[PDB]
RNA sequence: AAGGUCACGGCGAGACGAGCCGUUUAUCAUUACGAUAGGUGUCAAGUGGAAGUGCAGUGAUGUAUGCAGCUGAGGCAUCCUAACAGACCCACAGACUUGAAC
RNA sequence: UUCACAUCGACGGGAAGGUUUGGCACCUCGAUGUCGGCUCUUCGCCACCUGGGGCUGUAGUAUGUUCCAAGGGUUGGGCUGUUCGCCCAUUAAAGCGGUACGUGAGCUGGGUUCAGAACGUCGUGAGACAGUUCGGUCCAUAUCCGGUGUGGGCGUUAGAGCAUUGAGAGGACCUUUCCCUAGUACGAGAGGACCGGGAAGGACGCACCUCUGGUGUACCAGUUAUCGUGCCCACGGUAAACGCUGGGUAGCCAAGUGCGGAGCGGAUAACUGCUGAAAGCAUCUAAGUAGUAAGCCCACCCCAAGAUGAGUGCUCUCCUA
RNA sequence: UCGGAGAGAGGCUCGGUGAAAUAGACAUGUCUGUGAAGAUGCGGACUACCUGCACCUGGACAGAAAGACCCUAUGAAGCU
RNA sequence: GACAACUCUCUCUAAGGAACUCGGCAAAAUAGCCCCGUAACUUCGGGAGAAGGGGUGCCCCCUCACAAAGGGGGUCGAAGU
RNA sequence: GGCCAGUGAGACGAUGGGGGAUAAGCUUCAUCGUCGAGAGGGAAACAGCCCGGAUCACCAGCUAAGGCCCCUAAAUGACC
RNA sequence: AGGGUGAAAAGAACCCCCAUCGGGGAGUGAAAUAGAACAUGAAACCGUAAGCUCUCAAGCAGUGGGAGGGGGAACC
């Protein structure tokens, strides 16, 4: 559940602190976009020496949400921080260390991405 | 909001009549309640 | 929309509506007889039925229950150390609303409470 | 017309069925008070068509009118409350004589189609109904959650029929499509059918293979 | 008369008319129908440890009795209370023509 | 490149539209309330995108153009009071219009045409500028037609109960991205097939409470201040509806869940054809036939015999006056 | 965004009292055409049993104030 | 009496938090008493309650006046003007 | 000549023209027609086009403009 | 703004419904369906009864033709 105004984390050490989400690609539904979908953030504030600086846009992933999140089984995973990880729209992301957990569904599509995580769950 | 024109006597004497007979519709009521309260078995009507 | 809500609430606000039914069950324990509207006999009817099967287990606890419902002090008192002997094994159903005609002034629906 | 002859059960809540596979799927359960059976079949001589006509929740005869109960007792079977014939191509190879079926035969055509009277919603307005939209809440607006515009000026002169007033929403019958069949149990004779179905658990439910 | 309507008990039905299901010896009995609303009894469910008494504490407060206690418009069971009394509309064979069969 | 017509078409000509700016001033000054937004329409095409086709200076992938096509679709924002006036990010695309520049007895009043005030300028002056600037109560309990729902009488020719065919009418048949085909065909390579399948979506539509949650003024619990129950304990009342808070069954909701847009089949439009003369060649056509579009009709789903053309049949109900 | 549930007062139904502005008479359909050139009252075709109640407001160039904008009057008045 | 729509007076609302809009207008949010700290500017009066941060409920204890308040310890709720 | 009026912006059609854009149901003049002040039939409806001029009665007839399949009168009559 | 029972109050003894409002008899008067919100009493407007008639309708609602029926037995 972003909308096109959230303020995001990262949960990598790509550079980015927070950054702003501005109108989902892909699904053209884009008044609601979970997780495992990308986002056209625009960085709020960055540590200040990466090449990633002020108001930047740029191409993003939600990694974290705080809507629920359904699964198969019958579980519903829910982080309290809603979480970006900065991309490139050929594979990898730009950051190489991960922060927090992830759901490791997203792995089937975003194989990069959950490989450097410290919890799949 | 305000009417254009005065109705008939024909439409008005329509539906004071359909006043009227609504209430004569629940006078039967009133006269089974009648015919039933003369004294009888019933547990109403201390 | 109504659907499944089966609480049977009178003219009243929410406040005012607890008074009338507590005021009101006060009064029919006291008299035996009552005269409401109808509605307001189907609202008593549960709350009333509660009170006496309140009393009929008389302990310490039930016995403050009661006593923070009802208004009146004594119309408790007298009532659970007397009615384990009136409704002994009548198990349920202990009102009756013996109806009666209407209101003149509302033509308002009106009945005529027991207890039996 | 329809596919083939269907049953009519009775909504039964929900619940889930966890599939042994580990997944988890919603479900209702449906019903049956008392036993389909046929009660009639016409044909396209005597009658305009081809039909058969079963019954459900059989009653006291108290309950059921003297034509009604002429009617049942004529093809000689029980009483029953509800009544409805299928329709079908005309194919039917039925004595109308309580020809009582049962599902040997919904396990195979695992999708069936059920129609179901939804449940009622009184007087609903505009915003729900139609799913139209709201003025501004604030900003000075007067006029929210209200109809808003119906037509154009001098010319239209009158309002599109078929326009989107409020009005009664619920209470007609409603199909629901090609919704799968899923474990079933004879021994209760209890049918736990995927997806949600029509009805506060408690309604006739007609109950027919689809028509794809 | 068949059927209704009203009345009476109410609803997953409803602005009001509508709809729909009741309307008591509300079975009794060898596999489905005669519990409609309440009350009661019980179970799900919610909240979360009652009151009193005891113990430990100078006192706040804790602790045991104790998933107890208050909830119980949901599920079944229960005729304890109420569907008592009634009343009303409804009719008599469905004008006229030829055709056909016996 | 040569080549008028793949594409652009100088010079000039002939039309349709009616929506821009206008010309008249015919209705309306005992009054026809203006711009722009909100909500809700519905219609037109000369088509922006999705369906099919020619031609291409079309290798393919992109296209460029025209042809039938209005079934659908036709974003979110920043700036301005200001509909292609516009940068940002997408997106299949992010159309132009008519509807008293649709819609103020439906809404706002940012602008303009009120009274205050000021700036520049004109006027000696009062004052003024289709220049600017800040402030400025837009009233309404539908008689009738219209529309959405729902009834009653009465018609249906004896009177009724159910089941029902369905003329008619309505909603819906929408759309992107991936993978297999296949790195295949095609190409020096770069790149890289619309013939068909499979999945995920998106908007939408119909539902439903199993899960997740919102509210839940039935309910439980913490607690503030105070009054009452004699008093302590335990409770009750009170604080624009319950004091403020946590938790919540049913209900109703959704950001939740389930499903849905189909083998569809028949005519077609553009177009490609087949046989074939008028015209002892040719030509899709004149005879006759084949293929083929989200477009038309049936199918799908919901009403429906007030369909007065008032249908159908299996049961009832009485011929005593 | 994108609505939703709830409490109160109205709305709704029943008993009592009981106004209003408006009002030529109205037995008061849709589309097109016409017409003082944007008609329920005319023409052609379609459509529609009679009549209630709730609900919305597109029309009846709906009500309100013989327009307040524009012009005229050898009108009135204020200021220079 | 019933408890449709809808207008008003109000309470709450998952995830985002001005994206609405002519303009965050209207809501919501801070807030009391102590204690730390308080900037640019300045007419040197002001700014300034700037900003910002912390504790505060009840019980027990002794001190500082030894009327309040503070120090130490405890107990309770999710939340202590 | 007397006694006395009303009228003083007409409209369209035909023609000859100006203005306009040889645009307007535009405007402006000259010569006529109808409406104005005029009915009736044809023109579907339809002041200004066509015939025609209304003293009245007639449940009588002949024609003009226009027409003869049905709605509506009259040949779905002849031959090219 | 609000006038006019009767010639004379003779303005209604008595009875019944009866909260003493208002009525029906009785009585007065020539008459009180002249009885006190009383003298003729029009029209609008509100009812009642009888005669014929409207529920597939279309209309400034009349008119010319008149089906069917009712009236006293050709006129309405």
Not at chain 2, 21 to 30: C, F, H, M
Not at chain 3, 26 to 40: E, M, N, P, S
Not at chain 3, 94 to 113: E, F, H, K, S, V
Not at chain 4, 125 to 140: A, D, E, P
Request: proline share 4%; aromatic share 6%.
């Amino acid at each position: 559940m972003i909308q096109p105004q959230t303020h995001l984390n990262v949960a990598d050490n790509s550079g980015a602190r927070e950054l702003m989400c501005i109108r989902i690609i892909g699904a053209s539904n884009r008044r609601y976009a979970r997780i495992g979908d990308v986002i056209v953030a625009v960085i709020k504030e960055a540590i200040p020496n990466t090449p990633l600086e002020r108001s930047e846009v740029i191409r993003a992933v939600v990694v974290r949400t705080c809507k629920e999140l359904k699964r198969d089984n019958g579980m519903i995973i829910r982080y309290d921080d809603n979480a970006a990880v900065i991309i490139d729209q050929e594979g990898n992301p730009k950051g190489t260390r991960i922060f927090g957990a992830i759901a490791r569904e997203l792995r089937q599509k975003f194989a990069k991405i959950v490989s450097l995580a410290p919890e799949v769950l | 909001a305000v009417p254009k024109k005065r109705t008939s006597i024909y439409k008005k004497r329509i539906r004071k009549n359909i006043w009227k007979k609504k209430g004569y519709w629940a006078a039967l009521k009133a006269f089974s309640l009648a015919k039933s309260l003369s004294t009888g078995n019933s547990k109403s009507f201390f | 929309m109504k659907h499944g809500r089966k609480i049977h609430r009178l003219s009243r606000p929410a406040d005012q509506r607890r008074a009338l039914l507590r005021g009101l069950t006060t009064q029919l324990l006291k008299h035996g007889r009552i005269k409401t509207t109808r509605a307001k006999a189907s609202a008593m009817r549960k709350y009333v039925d509660k009170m006496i099967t309140l009393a009929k287990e008389g302990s310490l606890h039930k016995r403050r229950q009661a006593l923070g419902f009802i208004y009146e002090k004594q119309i408790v008192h007298a009532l659970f150390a007397e009615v384990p002997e009136r409704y002994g094994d009548r198990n349920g159903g202990y009102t009756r609303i013996i109806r009666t005609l209407p209101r003149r002034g509302d033509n308002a629906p009106m009945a005529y409470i027991e207890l039996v | 017309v329809d596919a083939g002859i269907g049953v009519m059960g009775t909504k039964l809540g929900m619940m889930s069925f966890f599939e042994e596979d580990g997944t988890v799927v919603p479900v209702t359960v449906i019903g049956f008070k008392e036993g389909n059976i046929v009660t009639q079949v016409k044909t396209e001589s005597t009658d305009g068509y081809n039909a058969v006509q079963v019954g459900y929740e059989r009653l006291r005869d108290r309950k059921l009118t003297m034509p009604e109960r002429g009617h049942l007792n004529k093809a000689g079977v029980i009483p029953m409350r509800h009544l409805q014939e299928f329709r079908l191509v005309s194919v039917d190879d039925f004595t109308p004589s309580q020809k009582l079926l049962f599902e040997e035969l919904f396990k195979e055509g695992d999708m069936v189609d059920i129609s179901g009277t939804t449940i009622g919603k009184g007087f609903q307005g505009g915003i729900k109904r139609h799913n139209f939209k709201r003025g501004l809440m604030t900003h000075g607006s007067k006029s929210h959650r209200a109809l808003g515009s119906i037509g154009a000026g001098t010319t239209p002169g009158h309002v599109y029929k078929g326009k989107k007033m409020p009005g009664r929403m619920g209470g007609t019958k409603t199909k629901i499509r090609k919704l799968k069949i899923m474990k079933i149990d004879t021994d209760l004779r209890v049918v736990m059918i995927k997806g949600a179905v029509p009805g506060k658990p408690g309604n006739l439910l007609r109950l027919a293979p689809a028509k794809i």
